[PDB]
C-alpha cells in the first residue's frame, strides 16, 4: 500500500496564474508517477508520465517534475479550459494507487444570481403532489443561502439543493432549489417565497408568488 | 484502441456484479495490461486488478478473493466479476489499457448496489409564474437508479441550459434543468424537455405550456 497524498482537496486560482499541485509518496517510487486530469462527465486522462513528460496533445503550459517521494504538477498560465480535477498516480508496483485528487476553482468578479420561481405544475398537482422550484443562475461565489418561506415562515424540511460544476465558459455556478411538500399542505398556505442571500448584496433577492396567482 | 464497458447498472446486495469490457482497434492478446479501475462517489479512484495479454491476472488486496478478471479472446473482451457486493461497491467502473507510457480509458459505466426497485420518473414542466429573457424548467422526480439523460428540443437547444445533478430523496432521485431563451421566443416557439431513463425503458417528451391566468 504505497499511499499517494495530495496537498489540498480544493484550490482557488485566477486565469494567468501559475498553480502547482503536489503529491508525496509513502515509499520511494523513483520517476514512476503519472498525473491525470479529469473534467466533469469524462474519464481521467493522462497528462504527465514518468513525472516530467507531457503526453500526446498536452499543452506546453503543463510541466511536472520531482523524484523520490516528492512530485509536482505545474500549470503555467492557468486557462479556463484547465478547470478540472487532477490526480497523481504511482505505477512503481501493484497495487496502483492514486492521490485523493485536487479540484481547481477559478476566481472571478462576484456575480449576483438571476432567480426564477416556479409553482407546482398542474400535472404534479393533479397527480397529488406539490414541488416548488427556484433556479439561481450564473452566480459567484458558490456559497449562497436559499431560504424557503411558506406564508412568511421558514421551511427547511423537504428542500433539495443541487449545484452545477463551475462553468469553464464564465466561471459561474448555478443551482436549483426544490421544496417538496404534500399537496394538502401546499393548498393550506398562500404565499411561497425563495430568498437568496449572497455576498453580492446585504439585501436578499426575493422571488415570490401567491397561490391565488 | 477503444474500450467500452457494459453490463447491468443495478445489482442487488450480496449478489455478483459482472461487467464486460469490449475492446476494438487492438488485440487483447498482443500486449499491455488490461485493467478494471473504479471511481467512488466523492471521486476517489481505486485500481481493482488486471489481466495481462498472456492471460495472467492480479488483484488489489483490498478486494480479498471477491474479484475475478477473465477474458474471451475470440470476442476480444475481458470481464470483471466482483462477488458479494455491498453499497460501498457503488461506483463508476472503468476499463483501461496500460503500457509503453500510454493509458487509454473507457467512458465507464455506473453500477449502483442497492435492493431498491427500478422506478420510472415523473416529468413535470416548469412554466414561468403567471424581461429580456424567460427561464423555463423541467423537473424529473422519483426515479431509480441513475442515470437519466435530459435534453431540450432534441438537443438542438443547448446554449442557455443548466442541468443540475440528481440527488437522492427518500429512496428516489430528483433532477432538474433550466433553459433560458429570449422573451419573444416562447411560447410561440415550442420548448420540450426530452427525458430518457434507460433502466425503466422510459422516454418522455414534455412540452412546456404557459400557465392559465
Amino acid at each position: 500500500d504505497i499511499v499517494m497524498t495530495q496537498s489540498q482537496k480544493f484550490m482557488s486560482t485566477s486565469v494567468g496564474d501559475r498553480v502547482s499541485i503536489t503529491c508525496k509518496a509513502s515509499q520511494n517510487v523513483g520517476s514512476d508517477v503519472a498525473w491525470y486530469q479529469q473534467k466533469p462527465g469524462q474519464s481521467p486522462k493522462l497528462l504527465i508520465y514518468s513525472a516530467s513528460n507531457r503526453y500526446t496533445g498536452v499543452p506546453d503550459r503543463f510541466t511536472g517534475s520531482g523524484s523520490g517521494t516528492d512530485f509536482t504538477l505545474t500549470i503555467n498560465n492557468m486557462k479556463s479550459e484547465d478547470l478540472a480535477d487532477y490526480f497523481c498516480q504511482q505505477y512503481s508496483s501493484y497495487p496502483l494507487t492514486f492521490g485523493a485528487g485536487t479540484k481547481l476553482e477559478l476566481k472571478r468578479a462576484d456575480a449576483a444570481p438571476t432567480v426564477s420561481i416556479f409553482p407546482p405544475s398542474s400535472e404534479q398537482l393533479t397527480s397529488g403532489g406539490a414541488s416548488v422550484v427556484c433556479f439561481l443562475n450564473n452566480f459567484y461565489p458558490k456559497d449562497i443561502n436559499v431560504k424557503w418561506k411558506i406564508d412568511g415562515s421558514e421551511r427547511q424540511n423537504g428542500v433539495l439543493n443541487s449545484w452545477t460544476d463551475q462553468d469553464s465558459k464564465d466561471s459561474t455556478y448555478s443551482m436549483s432549489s426544490t421544496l417538496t411538500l404534500t399537496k394538502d399542505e401546499y393548498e393550506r398556505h398562500n404565499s411561497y417565497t425563495c430568498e437568496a442571500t449572497h455576498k453580492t448584496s446585504t439585501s436578499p433577492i426575493v422571488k415570490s408568488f401567491n397561490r391565488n396567482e | 484502441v477503444q474500450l467500452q464497458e457494459s453490463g447491468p447498472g443495478l445489482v442487488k446486495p450480496s449478489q455478483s456484479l459482472s461487467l464486460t469490457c469490449s475492446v476494438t482497434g487492438y488485440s487483447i492478446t498482443r500486449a499491455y495490461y488490461w485493467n478494471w479501475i473504479r471511481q467512488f462517489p466523492g471521486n476517489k479512484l481505486e485500481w481493482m486488478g488486471y489481466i495481462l495479454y498472456d492471460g495472467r491476472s492480479d488483484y488489489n488486496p483490498s478486494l480479498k478473493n471477491r474479484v475475478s478478471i477473465t477474458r474471451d479472446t475470440s470476442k476480444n473482451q475481458f470481464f470483471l466479476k466482483l462477488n458479494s457486493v455491498t453499497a460501498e461497491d457503488t461506483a463508476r467502473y472503468y476499463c483501461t489499457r496500460e503500457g509503453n507510457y500510454r493509458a487509454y480509458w473507457g467512458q465507464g459505466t455506473l453500477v449502483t448496489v442497492s435492493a431498491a426497485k427500478t422506478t420510472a420518473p415523473s416529468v413535470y414542466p416548469l412554466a414561468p409564474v403567471c424581461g429580456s429573457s424567460v427561464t423555463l424548467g423541467c423537473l424529473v422526480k422519483g426515479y431509480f437508479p441513475e442515470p437519466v439523460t435530459l435534453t431540450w428540443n432534441s438537443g438542438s437547444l443547448s446554449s442557455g441550459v443548466h442541468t443540475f445533478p440528481a440527488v437522492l430523496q427518500s429512496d428516489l432521485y430528483t433532477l432538474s434543468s433550466s433553459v433560458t431563451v429570449t422573451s419573444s421566443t416562447w411560447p410561440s416557439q415550442s420548448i420540450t424537455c426530452n427525458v430518457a431513463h434507460p433502466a425503466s425503458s422510459t422516454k418522455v417528451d414534455k412540452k412546456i405550456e404557459p400557465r392559465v391566468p
Binding site: 514512476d32 503519472a34 498516480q89 501493484y94 | 499491455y32 495490461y33 503500457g99 507510457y101 493509458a103
Partner: peptide
C-alpha cells in the same frame, strides 16, 4: 515499472 511504465 508496471502499469503505463511497463515496456511491451
Amino acid at each position: 515499472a508496471v502499469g503505463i511504465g511497463a515496456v511491451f
